Write a protein that holds these residues in place. Structure first.
Motif, mmCIF file in Angstrom:
data_model
loop_
_atom_site.group_PDB
_atom_site.id
_atom_site.type_symbol
_atom_site.label_atom_id
_atom_site.label_comp_id
_atom_site.label_asym_id
_atom_site.label_seq_id
_atom_site.Cartn_x
_atom_site.Cartn_y
_atom_site.Cartn_z
ATOM 1 N N UNK A 141 7.393 19.067 -1.506
ATOM 2 C CA UNK A 141 8.096 18.698 -0.102
ATOM 3 C C UNK A 141 6.912 18.424 0.712
ATOM 4 N N UNK A 142 6.556 17.322 0.781
ATOM 5 C CA UNK A 142 5.643 16.831 1.673
ATOM 6 C C UNK A 142 6.170 16.784 3.162
ATOM 7 N N UNK A 143 5.167 16.866 4.307
ATOM 8 C CA UNK A 143 5.484 16.677 5.542
ATOM 9 C C UNK A 143 4.642 15.675 6.329
ATOM 10 N N UNK A 144 5.222 14.678 6.698
ATOM 11 C CA UNK A 144 4.730 13.545 7.697
ATOM 12 C C UNK A 144 4.765 14.104 9.167
ATOM 13 N N UNK A 145 3.409 14.410 9.612
ATOM 14 C CA UNK A 145 3.349 15.291 10.930
ATOM 15 C C UNK A 145 3.766 14.449 11.982
ATOM 16 N N UNK A 146 3.306 13.165 12.097
ATOM 17 C CA UNK A 146 3.430 12.194 13.354
ATOM 18 C C UNK A 146 4.906 11.895 13.445
ATOM 19 N N UNK B 240 -0.468 18.179 4.168
ATOM 20 C CA UNK B 240 0.328 19.257 4.427
ATOM 21 C C UNK B 240 1.535 19.343 3.507
ATOM 22 N N UNK B 241 1.876 20.549 3.162
ATOM 23 C CA UNK B 241 3.176 20.667 2.334
ATOM 24 C C UNK B 241 4.204 21.622 3.031
ATOM 25 N N UNK B 242 5.349 21.812 2.283
ATOM 26 C CA UNK B 242 6.455 22.648 2.979
ATOM 27 C C UNK B 242 6.985 23.667 1.810
ATOM 28 N N UNK C 8 -0.508 13.379 2.913
ATOM 29 C CA UNK C 8 -0.264 14.256 1.320
ATOM 30 C C UNK C 8 -0.676 15.797 1.959
ATOM 31 N N UNK D 113 2.092 10.275 -0.743
ATOM 32 C CA UNK D 113 3.208 10.308 -0.104
ATOM 33 C C UNK D 113 3.013 11.291 1.535
ATOM 34 N N UNK E 96 0.729 -0.983 0.037
ATOM 35 C CA UNK E 96 -0.118 0.039 0.066
ATOM 36 C C UNK E 96 1.028 1.281 -0.058
ATOM 37 N N UNK E 97 0.401 2.246 -0.372
ATOM 38 C CA UNK E 97 1.396 3.485 -0.406
ATOM 39 C C UNK E 97 1.729 3.919 0.768
ATOM 40 N N UNK E 98 2.790 4.403 1.035
ATOM 41 C CA UNK E 98 3.433 5.252 2.620
ATOM 42 C C UNK E 98 3.871 6.437 2.246
ATOM 43 N N UNK E 99 4.246 7.169 3.235
ATOM 44 C CA UNK E 99 4.692 8.243 2.996
ATOM 45 C C UNK E 99 6.074 8.601 2.424
ATOM 46 N N UNK F 244 6.592 15.117 14.769
ATOM 47 C CA UNK F 244 6.351 15.492 16.189
ATOM 48 C C UNK F 244 7.340 14.386 17.039
ATOM 49 N N UNK G 132 -3.275 8.295 3.996
ATOM 50 C CA UNK G 132 -2.241 8.652 2.876
ATOM 51 C C UNK G 132 -2.509 10.287 2.386
#
Ligand SMILES: [Mg+2]
Ligand SMILES: [Mg+2]
Ligand SMILES: [Mg+2]
Ligand SMILES: [Mg+2]
Ligand SMILES: [Mg+2]
Ligand SMILES: [Mg+2]
Ligand SMILES: [Mg+2]
Ligand SMILES: [Mg+2]
Ligand SMILES: [Mg+2]
Ligand SMILES: [Mg+2]
Ligand SMILES: [Mg+2]
Ligand SMILES: [Mg+2]
Ligand SMILES: [Mg+2]
Ligand SMILES: [Mg+2]
Ligand SMILES: [Mg+2]
Ligand SMILES: [Mg+2]
Ligand SMILES: [Mg+2]
Ligand SMILES: [Mg+2]
Ligand SMILES: [Mg+2]
Ligand SMILES: [Mg+2]
Ligand SMILES: [Mg+2]
Ligand SMILES: [Mg+2]
Ligand SMILES: [Mg+2]
Ligand SMILES: [Mg+2]
Ligand SMILES: [Mg+2]
Ligand SMILES: [Mg+2]
Ligand SMILES: [Mg+2]
Ligand SMILES: [Mg+2]
Ligand SMILES: [Mg+2]
Ligand SMILES: [Mg+2]
Ligand SMILES: [Mg+2]
Ligand SMILES: [Mg+2]
Lengths: 49, 80, 48, 115, 50
Positions: free
Chosen positions: C19-24, E24-26, E22, C11, C5-8, C27, E18
RNA sequence: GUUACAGACUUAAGCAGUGGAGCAUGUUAUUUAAUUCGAUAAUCCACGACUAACCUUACCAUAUUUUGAAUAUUAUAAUAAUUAUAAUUAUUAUAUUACAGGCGUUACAUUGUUGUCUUUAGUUCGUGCUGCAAAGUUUUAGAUUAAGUUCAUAAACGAACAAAACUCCAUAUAUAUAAUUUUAAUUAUAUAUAAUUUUAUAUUAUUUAAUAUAAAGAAAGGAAUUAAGACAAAUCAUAAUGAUCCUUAUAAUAUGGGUAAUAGACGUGCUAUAAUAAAAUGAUAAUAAAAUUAUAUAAAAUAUAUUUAAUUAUAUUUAAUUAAUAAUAUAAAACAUUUUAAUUUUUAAUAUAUUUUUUUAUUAUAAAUAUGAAUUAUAAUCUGAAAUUCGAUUAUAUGAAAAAAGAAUUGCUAGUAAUACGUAAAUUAGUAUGUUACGGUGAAUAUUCUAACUGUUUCGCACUAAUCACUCAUCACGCGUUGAA
């Protein structure tokens, strides 16, 4: 404002229940962000006539 | 396998070496049926905690090995 | 479920431009940094 | 060994991972892999017609198969959480977790049982 | 087949996460514009998902 | 540890139970290497747990893993996909640190959720008005309702969260659809309409409101919803997160053991203690509903237990159907014949006869059973790889206690209780005396006295983190000050 709907009160249109427990007009939700101190959340509930 | 058809409950053991030379068989099986092929072999059957030494007589032939290694301690009451 | 399955992670692979941000994850990293700062970081692991 | 918990490199399931979940999933995969073989061995064992030595050998083989080949070892976990009590099969979820999902509207139709 | 339905709803739930990720951007570590999104609604017709 | 009224399964009737017996299950205690952890007044105790053989499990013994389940950083190398023997990417391998991980500790850090007060009737905002003001009125003088719902009255007039209503189930009617072989049209399911019923005559109390009578109607229930506050009520063991602690160990895997130990005790249940009640039998198969069947439901039939066969239980083997079509599944009580010890309240030998599946006469027939099903012995079967600790059946034996149960105590006002009435599913590979659901048959009783506990109210109040409140004095510990001598 108010969370009762007066369109259903005196007319042919009747209220209906979403998942048999939420008046159609209502929509409830929450989202729980973590803080420095710990966990918290924010309930919102709107009515929409 | 309890039912007469499809029995007995057979397990792999170091049997032949024990038969040749008196080296006790440390079983952690406890559900292996005793057979006529090992009467007079020394078994050391597991008890949960400590392995229990037993010499298999001809009266044991039908039974399981775990039946002769009693797991719980004999109950008592502290009369206070 | 379906392990593919698609992951970060992916993305960055599929769309490098954004330029994505994985929040968890971010943190967690911030928490780790805070722990390091106040002398409550993880002890260094034994190798032997 | 060091690089993995179990003998075979299996993938992680998507979403909620847990140690118990991981253990179960791997076991399920191994069962799936070695299902036909186990069945064949069982058949060979429980045969009045076949040679007895062969059936004994098959029985021994079955006995010697690992923890992860066993169908009986599989336990239905919750998928959203990692609980293993009151796990409903129609939505692979634990009791509380199912209720939570149901009230939200994640299980599409499920709804309050009013009669 | 209810197994298949369950698998589909799991997939949908995983996709939601998923999508959230996605959202949230920077911008060169200057601005982090957090686009808020609703919970997704997945429409499974015979032909197509939407 | 206060007044006063009103309320209901509160009490009172009534029906069935618990409390005695044995078993089941939970809890306690104690035991144990471990008996994992939590729940533990109402608001714990078949509760978390819709199934503890292994696994699940978290606990214990013995073994063995150490960047491990992730994300990112830095390097070497190998394989595959794509292009026109090179290259781009994707992955894998070996390492490399930050770490990962923790059912470890704190629901007296939290989230969400839940229990109890509670389907109880309370909980507040604009404008106006009163009071120097905090505030009050509104939000109540009456009365009534199930009710802060309503009319009477009132410096008030409106407005919100609750209440009611819309909602779901069930009901009645209409329309639509179903080539009446997926048929049950006596149905199913979409869409409406229908009632919180209406009208009138009288009799009591003051135009209305209760009773009665009548005529009009199918018209009579259940479910969900349980506000604010409170109980630092429950949960960090659904899950997540704060702080804190563990990092060759408090993280990870296997093999076995434990969660099922047993002195006494405590709840919930189940089965009983026999004749207004138990057992055999009942194939032109007496009569249901609701729900399940691609991690299956398993029909008919053959075989063995068993000389007929049926029943019940297994095996053999899968017909049909993944379903208004087939299967689970001929519902069971009911009703009918037969039998039934205690019971010389019967039997069997004679006669007897207009009680003949029977009568009379004369002879002999001398506190647990032909109740109950605990406990145990042996043999088989089932599931599973495995049934010893520790599962479920069947058979042949075994046949404890128990003689309707002390003080006390639980549920229930109607399709309810009751039922020696059965049926289904969720959890399983496998096991329900539990849970959640369905129909069947179907009652008895009834309000005035008193305990409690909810409303709102009276009086009191030195309390305001609000009675786990506040608060008084000695004695004990230190450091001053001032008397007596
Ligand atoms: Mg009473
Ligand atoms: Mg007693
Ligand atoms: Mg008793
Ligand atoms: Mg704890
Ligand atoms: Mg406990
Ligand atoms: Mg274990
Ligand atoms: Mg951590
Ligand atoms: Mg652990
Ligand atoms: Mg809480
Ligand atoms: Mg606690
Ligand atoms: Mg007031
Ligand atoms: Mg008031
Ligand atoms: Mg209401
Ligand atoms: Mg018809
Ligand atoms: Mg409340
Ligand atoms: Mg507390
Ligand atoms: Mg609390
Ligand atoms: Mg925590
Ligand atoms: Mg956790
Ligand atoms: Mg560990
Ligand atoms: Mg227990
Ligand atoms: Mg209970
Ligand atoms: Mg009887
Ligand atoms: Mg048959
Ligand atoms: Mg059928
Ligand atoms: Mg019948
Ligand atoms: Mg007796
Ligand atoms: Mg009997
Ligand atoms: Mg009986
Ligand atoms: Mg299982
Ligand atoms: Mg009933
Ligand atoms: Mg009142």
């Amino acid at each position: 404002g108010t969370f009762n709907n007066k369109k259903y009160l005196w007319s042919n249109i009747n209220n209906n229940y979403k998942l048999n427990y939420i008046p159609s007009n209502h929509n409830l939700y929450n989202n729980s962000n973590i803080n420095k101190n710990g966990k918290y959340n924010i309930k919102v509930k709107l009515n929409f006539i | 396998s309890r039912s007469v058809w499809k029995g007995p409950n057979i397990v792999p053991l170091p049997i032949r070496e024990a038969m040749t030379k008196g080296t006790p068989i440390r079983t952690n099986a406890r559900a292996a049926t005793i057979l006529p092929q090992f009467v007079g072999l020394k078994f050391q059957i597991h008890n949960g905690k400590e392995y229990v030494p037993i010499e298999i007589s001809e009266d044991m032939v039908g039974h399981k090995l775990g039946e002769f290694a009693p797991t719980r301690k004999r109950f008592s009451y502290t009369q206070t | 479920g379906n392990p593919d399955i698609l992951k970060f992670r992916h993305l960055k692979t599929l769309y490098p431009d954004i330029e994505f941000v994985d929040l968890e994850e971010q943190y967690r990293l911030s928490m780790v940094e805070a722990k390091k700062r106040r002398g409550k970081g993880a002890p260094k692991k034994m190798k032997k | 060994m060091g690089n993995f918990r179990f003998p075979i490199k299996t993938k992680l399931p998507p979403g909620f991972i847990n140690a118990r979940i991981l253990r179960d999933n791997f076991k399920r995969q191994q069962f799936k892999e070695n299902e036909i073989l186990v069945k064949s061995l069982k058949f060979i064992a429980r045969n009045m017609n076949l040679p007895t030595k062969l059936r004994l050998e098959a029985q021994l083989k079955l006995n010697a198969l690992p923890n992860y080949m066993r169908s009986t070892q599989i336990k239905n976990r919750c998928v959203d959480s990692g609980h293993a009590r009151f796990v409903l099969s129609d939505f692979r979820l634990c009791r509380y977790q199912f209720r939570e999902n149901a009230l939200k509207g994640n299980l599409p139709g499920v709804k309050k049982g009013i009669w | 087949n209810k197994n298949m339905e369950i698998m589909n709803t799991m997939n949908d739930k995983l996709i939601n996460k998923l999508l959230y990720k996605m959202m949230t951007l920077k911008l060169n570590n200057m601005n982090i514009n957090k686009i808020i999104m609703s919970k997704t609604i997945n429409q499974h017709s015979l032909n197509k998902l939407n």
